[PDB]
Enzyme design. Structure first.
Site, PDB file in Angstrom:
ATOM      1  N   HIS A 139      26.331  -0.768  34.127  1.00  0.00           N
ATOM      2  CA  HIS A 139      26.787   0.050  35.069  1.00  0.00           C
ATOM      3  C   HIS A 139      27.491   1.439  34.361  1.00  0.00           C
ATOM      4  O   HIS A 139      27.977   2.244  34.987  1.00  0.00           O
ATOM      5  CB  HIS A 139      27.773  -0.662  36.012  1.00  0.00           C
ATOM      6  N   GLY A 147      32.069  -0.324  37.877  1.00  0.00           N
ATOM      7  CA  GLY A 147      31.758  -1.857  37.888  1.00  0.00           C
ATOM      8  C   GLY A 147      32.428  -2.588  36.588  1.00  0.00           C
ATOM      9  O   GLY A 147      31.640  -3.669  36.105  1.00  0.00           O
TER      10      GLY A 147
HETATM   11  O1  LIG Z   1      30.990  -6.317  36.822  1.00  0.00           O
HETATM   12  C1  LIG Z   1      30.382  -6.142  37.997  1.00  0.00           C
HETATM   13  N1  LIG Z   1      29.037  -6.391  38.306  1.00  0.00           N
HETATM   14  O2  LIG Z   1      28.137  -6.599  37.137  1.00  0.00           O
HETATM   15  C2  LIG Z   1      31.017  -5.663  39.256  1.00  0.00           C
HETATM   16  C3  LIG Z   1      30.808  -5.687  40.563  1.00  0.00           C
HETATM   17  C4  LIG Z   1      31.652  -5.206  41.521  1.00  0.00           C
HETATM   18  C5  LIG Z   1      32.719  -4.944  40.633  1.00  0.00           C
HETATM   19  C6  LIG Z   1      33.949  -4.052  41.354  1.00  0.00           C
HETATM   20  N2  LIG Z   1      34.997  -4.496  41.870  1.00  0.00           N
HETATM   21  C7  LIG Z   1      35.139  -5.019  43.152  1.00  0.00           C
HETATM   22  C8  LIG Z   1      36.480  -5.813  43.141  1.00  0.00           C
HETATM   23  C9  LIG Z   1      37.096  -5.746  42.083  1.00  0.00           C
HETATM   24  C10 LIG Z   1      38.466  -5.999  41.591  1.00  0.00           C
HETATM   25  C11 LIG Z   1      38.625  -5.875  40.249  1.00  0.00           C
HETATM   26 BR1  LIG Z   1      40.322  -6.376  39.819  1.00  0.00          BR
HETATM   27  C12 LIG Z   1      37.820  -5.132  39.310  1.00  0.00           C
HETATM   28  C13 LIG Z   1      36.452  -4.682  39.830  1.00  0.00           C
HETATM   29  C14 LIG Z   1      36.406  -5.032  41.168  1.00  0.00           C
HETATM   30  S1  LIG Z   1      36.538  -6.546  44.789  1.00  0.00           S
HETATM   31  C15 LIG Z   1      35.225  -5.476  45.349  1.00  0.00           C
HETATM   32  C16 LIG Z   1      35.685  -4.226  46.144  1.00  0.00           C
HETATM   33  C17 LIG Z   1      36.025  -2.953  45.286  1.00  0.00           C
HETATM   34  C18 LIG Z   1      36.327  -1.759  45.954  1.00  0.00           C
HETATM   35  C19 LIG Z   1      36.773  -2.103  47.115  1.00  0.00           C
HETATM   36  C20 LIG Z   1      36.596  -3.009  47.967  1.00  0.00           C
HETATM   37  C21 LIG Z   1      36.214  -4.091  47.461  1.00  0.00           C
HETATM   38  C22 LIG Z   1      34.195  -5.207  44.318  1.00  0.00           C
HETATM   39  S2  LIG Z   1      32.804  -5.303  39.231  1.00  0.00           S
HETATM   40 ZN   LIG Z   2      26.281  -7.739  38.959  1.00  0.00          ZN
END
Ligand SMILES: O=C(NO)c1ccc(Cn2c3c(c4cc(Br)ccc42)S[C@@H](c2ccccc2)C3)s1
Ligand SMILES: [Zn+2]
Ligand SMILES: [K+]
Ligand SMILES: [K+]
Length: 402
Positions: A139, A147
């Site tokens: 990403h 991400g």
């Molecule tokens: O590495 C990945 N895929 O390979 C990811 C997929 C999604 C990501 C981004 N994300 C999200 C959360 C969250 C909590 C921390 Br601490 C750091 C990053 C975060 S809860 C959710 C969320 C984000 C924003 C608003 C509401 C909910 C998605 S990382």
């Molecule tokens: Zn993923």
């Protein structure tokens, strides 16, 4: 023939320095070591630079000077924030879902170090296949962090990828639940690097790309697949799914790409967000032996006898991600070295044993048209790409796969 794996003491310490993942890399490494797979694998230490300028040149081959400087400043300052510092971090999206912590740059750079070491190992023909569970961050953008992906190790590793041979082409396949937007964007105009992703696509789902393109007209939305001579080179499979359906959806496409493109190297992203046990709860993929979509895809990729680089990435269920990646590593050893490995269904006692309950079984505790239109669309796109690059193929076997 000499499968490779990337691990090291500093690599272990820094890869397990992310507050998001905690000690996921430590658990994965300890699970590979607990099954006595390390003696069956060749160590590939992370690549180090003789000067910070060399590291700057390597990282900025894809990224920008300002973004790297901002990330370094974030690492330095986290070891309050000023208004200008907040402004600069917001401009590069170095917050929110990519929060700062004292080891942001070091961890993000260590991932790239491992990926480039694997790339060098593949180029030098030392290892047929090299594996790195500390990377797989697809990403990361040139001037953006999305991400929890700050540095895109995949893009730099592919770029790094001589015998007489001929033009070099690399096939990237992404199996993460999320779309490989960073790698696709990096090679949007490049036909040599062929980017393919299989992912879930729903409105409001991160990132929302790799699906039908929304435009302002009355015509039906289409799939954007590159520009210039890199047109028709970006392939995406958005799915609304069990192991068998996922395997049937992926198989023909990757077989067609291998047959047509005829790449020199293959790079696989094996993000573990698609597991049914994953907290996201989107796909229903597993790690079961009897015949898991992951293992099927990996075996079919390895059957091409093409040098390959396997990366990790997404996944929040650290014990089950470790189980999946250990099974993938064992299957890669079996397919490449030609030596069968009998993984014990009962998990051997080790350091992180207590976190593999409550059944302590190697298999995960889980009890289990759009596709044809997608197949036709990707077949036509592949035909157009082959004609654009004037590639030699029969156009008969590829149709028989579908
Ligand atoms: O590495 C990945 N895929 O390979 C990811 C997929 C999604 C990501 C981004 N994300 C999200 C959360 C969250 C909590 C921390 Br601490 C750091 C990053 C975060 S809860 C959710 C969320 C984000 C924003 C608003 C509401 C909910 C998605 S990382
Ligand atoms: Zn993923
Ligand atoms: K993907
Ligand atoms: K491309």
């Amino acid at each position: 023939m000499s499968v490779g794996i990337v691990y090291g003491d500093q690599y272990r310490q820094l890869c397990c320095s992310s507050p998001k993942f905690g000690d996921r890399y430590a658990l994965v490494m300890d699970l590979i070591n607990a099954y006595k797979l390390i003696p069956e694998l060749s160590r590939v230490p992370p690549l180090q630079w003789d000067s910070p300028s060399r590291m700057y040149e390597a990282v900025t081959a894809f990224h920008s000077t300002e973004y790297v400087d901002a990330l370094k400043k974030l690492q330095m300052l986290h070891c309050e924030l000023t208004a200008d510092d907040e402004l600069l971090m917001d401009s590069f999206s170095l917050n929110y879902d990519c929060p700062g912590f004292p080891s942001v740059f070091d961890y993000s750079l260590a991932a790239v170090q491992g990926s480039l070491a694997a790339a060098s190992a593949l180029i030098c023909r030392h290892c047929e296949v090299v594996i790195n569970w500390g990377g797989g961050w697809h990403h990361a953008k040139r001037s953006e962090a999305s991400g929890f992906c700050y540095l895109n190790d995949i893009v730099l590793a592919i770029h790094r990828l001589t015998s007489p041979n001929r033009q070099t082409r690399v096939l990237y396949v992404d199996l993460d639940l999320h779309h490989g937007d960073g790698v696709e964007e990096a090679f949007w105009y490049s036909p040599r690097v062929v980017t393919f992703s299989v992912h879930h696509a729903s409105p409001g789902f991160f990132p929302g790309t790799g699906t039908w393109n929304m435009v302002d007209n009355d015509k039906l939305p289409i799939f954007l697949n590159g520009a210039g001579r890199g047109r028709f080179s970006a392939f995406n499979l958005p799915l609304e799914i069990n192991d068998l359906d996922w395997s049937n959806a992926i198989g023909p496409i990757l077989d067609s790409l291998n047959i047509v493109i005829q790449p020199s190297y293959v790079v696989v992203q094996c993000g573990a967000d698609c597991l049914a046990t994953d907290p996201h709860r989107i796909f229903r993929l597993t790690n079961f032996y009897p015949n898991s979509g992951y293992l099927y895809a990996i075996k079919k990729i390895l059957s091409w006898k093409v040098p390959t680089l396997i990366l990790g990435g997404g996944g929040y269920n650290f014990p089950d991600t470790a189980r999946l990646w250990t099974r993938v590593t064992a299957l890669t050893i079996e397919e490449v070295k030609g030596k069968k490995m009998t993984i014990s269904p009962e998990i051997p006692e080790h350091s992180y044993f207590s976190r593999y309950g409550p059944d302590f079984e190697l298999d995960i505790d889980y009890f289990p048209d759009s596709i044809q239109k997608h197949h036709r669309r990707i077949l036509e796109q592949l035909r157009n790409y082959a004609d654009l690059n004037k590639l030699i193929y029969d156009y008969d076997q590829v149709y028989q796969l579908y």
